[PDB]
Amino acid sequence: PPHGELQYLGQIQHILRCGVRKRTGTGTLSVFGMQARYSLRDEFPLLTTKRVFWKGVLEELLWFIKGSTNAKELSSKGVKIWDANGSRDFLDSLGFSTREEGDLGPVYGFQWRHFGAEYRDMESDYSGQGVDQLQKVIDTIKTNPDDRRIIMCAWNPRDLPLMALPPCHALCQFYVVNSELSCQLYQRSGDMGLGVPFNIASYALLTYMIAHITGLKPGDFIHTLGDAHIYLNHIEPLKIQLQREPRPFPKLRILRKVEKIDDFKAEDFQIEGYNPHPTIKM
Amino acid sequence: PPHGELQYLGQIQHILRCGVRKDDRTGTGTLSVFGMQARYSLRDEFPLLTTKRVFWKGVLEELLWFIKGSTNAKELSSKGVKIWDANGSRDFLDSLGFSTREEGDLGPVYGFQWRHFGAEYRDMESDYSGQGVDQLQKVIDTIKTNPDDRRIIMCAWNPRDLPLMALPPCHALCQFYVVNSELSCQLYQRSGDMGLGVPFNIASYALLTYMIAHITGLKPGDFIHTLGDAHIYLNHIEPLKIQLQREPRPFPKLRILRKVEKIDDFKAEDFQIEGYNPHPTIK
């Protein structure tokens, strides 16, 4: 079968061959509605035509599981991707003055384990408050794997205003058939250049983690896009990437048996056979 | 130009050749596939499937019902649409522990989530003004002020309210897109019976995309139907195979007889599907 990465690339071509020109501007070729499927059967979708910040992926996900909404908690691990939206300055440009530095608000972490609970600050303890979606999802996979209501949604219209940054991961569904676990992510906005690759890895990792705990095997991962765009700043770099030939995907391994989703630790994972192409500038 | 219904029948074809056996809530076998997407042009035509008639009166009347924010199945039944009565009956409500609800009270379903998301639900006769987020109107407001915005979502999945309604929303969420004065829409359906409900669904949001376009003075663009659990009942394989052989006829055309300016001002009499001739029934 066709190397999975070809889909991501097959899309970049489309965004350019049919994307229409159009915050902070910077320009962008957009497209509306796309879907790519990546296999998780004895392989992990970690694009090779360009290196992917695996540590960021793995370290950020574990950060969501905890339900943490503190940018600092994640940066203290070396991943500074969420710091910008945590700086005292930014929080101010949003009206959030009483807000402590590092507080992102009811973002992913909060939505995943305390959906619906009234948000206060990153320190407050929301235990027993809200709906623990991540856990309910795991529980259903276990007792009713044929359920078509296994959905985890981070889009809370009532909390959007309090967020330092709106979700680009409205929701994701889980599917179980023949002992194989699949997941479909619905991204409202995707930066094909510096985001989608990270995103693919992010949710494919979650599927593995979930499949491990439910005692199932990973299947497919459907990445569905709403507004897929390319920033003109990447029109060149990417044009070079397309040149590159996709190398066989690496493999993910869970070095130890784990019971609860929270018990997962960074050291529990290993990426073997990851041979990505060089890195120019982007 | 390739006909639009070919995209639909194509998915039925995919399910047949690649779908696997999967049981539903009652134990009934179905042939399933996870993750699907289809695009339907809404430009000078309306995607109302023709290889099998679609209950248009039901689509149109049910949509109107959602916009009102109604959760009373009676209000819909009093229009000829009986698709929500079973879920609101006296017996079905008791068996769910809702013995204190008057007949017809569906719970915080679609209507409520669209106009009052997050509002504290009481009953189908309580007033929820100013309560909750009017996602519907917010969509219209955004399409007008910031057409390039890519956070124009209308989510009906409310984890908190799920255990208070008849059954979980089938239409998790939809997103609107605007480009070159055209309004495109994408729907995410978590579950869909390819031959029984998907058609009805395509017509619902195609019509909604027509109404929002009308109000914001834009032209209908495309409708992307993204499915999660696409399936067909096993005992429906044979009749479906017959339908597949049928040749799709030109999609009809929808018309807005008068000029409407508010989403809530739309009436059933304001619509007209001209040129609809679907194939005869099959079984």
Where do the domains of chain A lie? 1-282
DSSP state at residue A70: B
In terms of Cα–Cα distance, which of B80, B30, B32 is closest to B56? Answer: B80
Handedness of CA B27, B28, B29, B30 (dihedral sign): negative
Nearest CB among A33, A35, A173 relative to B190 is that of A173
CA distances from B127 to A240, B79, B83, B111, B130 (A): 59, 23, 25, 13, 9
Q: CB count, 10 Å around CB of B214?
A: 19
CA distances from A223 to A60, A61, A115, A204 (A): 19, 17, 23, 10
- CB burial of A207-221 (b: ≥16 within 10 Å; e: otherwise) equals bbbbbbbbebebbbb
In terms of Cα–Cα distance, which of B193, B176, B192 is closest to B184? Answer: B176
At A167, is the secondary structure helix, strand, or coil?
A: coil
In terms of Cα–Cα distance, which of B256, B251, B245, B241 is closest to B209? Answer: B256
Report yes or no: B189 at the A interface, CB cutoff 8 Å: no
Report yes or no: B196 at the A interface, CB cutoff 8 Å: no
In terms of Cα–Cα distance, which of B189, B248, B270, B232 is closest to B47? Answer: B248
Beta carbons within 8 Å of B159's beta carbon, 6+ residues apart: A115, A116, A131, A133, A153
Binding-face residues of B in 78-117 toward A, CB within 8 A: 117
Beta carbons within 8 Å of B48's beta carbon, 6+ residues apart: B54, B56, B203, B206, B251, B252, B273, B276
CA distance A19 to A232: 11
Report yes or no: B177 at the A interface, CB cutoff 8 Å: yes
Under an 8 A CB cutoff, do B179 and A22 touch?
yes
**CB-count burial class (<10 Å; 0-12, 13-18, 19+) for B257:** exposed
Q: CB count, 10 Å around CB of B170?
A: 17
CA distance B278 to B265: 30
Give yes or no for a contact between A256 and A218, defined as CB atoms under 8 angstroms apart: no
Q: CB count, 10 Å around CB of B88?
A: 25
Strands B219-233 and A29-39: unpaired
What is the dihedral angle through the alpha carbons of B204, B209, B212, B214, rounded to the nearest 10 degrees? Answer: -110
Per the listing, tokens 């494919």 go with A204
Tokens of A37: 């499927």
Residue spans of alpha helices (H) in A77-220: 88-92, 108-114, 133-143, 196-214
> Residue B260 corresponds to which amino acid?
V
Q: Say which CATH architecture domain B1-283 belongs to.
A: 2-Layer Sandwich (3.30)
**CB-count burial class (<10 Å; 0-12, 13-18, 19+) for A95:** exposed
Report yes or no: B176 at the A interface, CB cutoff 8 Å: no
Give yes or no for a contact between B252 and B271, defined as CB atoms under 8 angstroms apart: no
- Identify the H or E element spanning A71: helix A71-75
DSSP state at residue A117: S
At A165, is the secondary structure helix, strand, or coil?
A: coil
Beta carbons within 8 Å of A253's beta carbon, 6+ residues apart: A269, A270, A272
**CB-count burial class (<10 Å; 0-12, 13-18, 19+) for B85:** middle
Binding-face residues of B in 199-228 toward A, CB within 8 A: 222, 224, 226, 228
**CB-count burial class (<10 Å; 0-12, 13-18, 19+) for B135:** buried
CA distance B226 to B205: 12
Q: State the resolution, in angstroms.
A: 2.5
Give yes or no for a contact between B188 and B229, defined as CB atoms under 8 angstroms apart: no
Strand partners, A187: A225
Tokens of A229: 């765009």
CA distances from A26 to A19, A163, A235 (A): 15, 24, 12
Give yes or no for a contact between B54 and B278, defined as CB atoms under 8 angstroms apart: yes
- Identify the H or E element spanning A279: none
- Judged by phi (left if over 0) then psi (alpha if -120 to 50, else beta), residue A178 lies in left
What is the dihedral angle through the alpha carbons of A161, A23, A50, A271, rounded to the nearest 10 degrees? Answer: -10
Report yes or no: B23 at the A interface, CB cutoff 8 Å: yes
A vs B: CB pairs below 8 A:
124
CA distance A78 to A62: 13
At A65, is the secondary structure helix, strand, or coil?
A: helix
- Identify the H or E element spanning A56: helix A54-65
Report yes or no: B46 at the A interface, CB cutoff 8 Å: no
- Let me know if A168 is a catalytic residue: yes
In terms of Cα–Cα distance, which of A170, A179, A28, A13 is closest to B226? Answer: A170
Strand partners, B226: B37, B188
* Way the structure was solved: X-ray
Annotated catalytic residue, options B18, B155, B170, B185: B170
CA distance B4 to B38: 9
Q: How many residues does chain A have?
A: 282
Tokens of B240: 């479906």
Q: CB count, 10 Å around CB of B233?
A: 17
Chain B closest CA to A158's CA: distance in Å?
Answer: 6
CA distances from A50 to A185, A192, A242, A260, B153 (A): 22, 12, 10, 33, 32
- What is the CATH topology of the domain spanning A1-282? Thymidylate Synthase; Chain A (3.30.572)
CA distance B83 to A167: 34
CA distance A263 to A271: 19
What single string gives the DSSP state of each residue in chain B? ---THHHHHHHHHHHHHH-EEEE-TTS-EEEEEEEEEEEEE-TTS----SSS---HHHHHHHHHHHHTT--BHHHHHTTT--TTSGGGSHHHHHTTT-TTSPTTB--S-HHHHHHHBT-----TTS--TT-SB-HHHHHHHHHHH-TT-S--EEE---TTTGGGSSS--SEEEEEEEEETTEEEEEEEEEEEETTTTHHHHHHHHHHHHHHHHHHTT-EEEEEEEEEEEEEEEGGGHHHHHHHHHSPPPPP-EEEE-S---SGGG--GGGEEEES--PPPP--
Strand partners, B227: B36, B189
In terms of Cα–Cα distance, which of A160, A179, A182 is closest to A111? Answer: A160
Q: Across chain A, which distance is largest between two alpha carbons, in Å?
A: 55
Give yes or no for a contact between A172 and A203, defined as CB atoms under 8 angstroms apart: yes
Nearest CB among A130, A153, A175 relative to B157 is that of A153
> Residue A131 corresponds to which amino acid?
V
Beta carbons within 8 Å of A22's beta carbon, 6+ residues apart: A28, A30, B148, B179
Gaps after residue numbers in chain A (C–N over 2.5 angstroms)? 22
In terms of Cα–Cα distance, which of B138, B137, B132 is closest to B71? Answer: B132
- CB burial of A190-203 (b: ≥16 within 10 Å; e: otherwise) equals bbbbebbbbbbbbb
Name the E strands within chain A: 20-21, 29-39, 151-153, 171-177, 180-191, 217-230, 251-254, 269-272
Give yes or no for a contact between B5 and B49, defined as CB atoms under 8 angstroms apart: yes
CA distance A174 to A167: 19
Q: What are phi and psi of A9, to 5 degrees?
A: -70, -45
Strands A217-230 and A180-191: parallel
The set of long-range contacts for A17-23, using a CB threshold of 8 Å and a minimum separation of 24, is A19/A229, A19/A230, A20/B179, A20/B180, A22/B148, A22/B179
Chain A closest CA to B119's CA: distance in Å?
Answer: 9
Chain B closest CA to A222's CA: distance in Å?
Answer: 6
Beta carbons within 8 Å of A128's beta carbon, 6+ residues apart: none
In a 13 Å sphere around the CA of B93, the CA atoms on its Cβ side amount to: 17
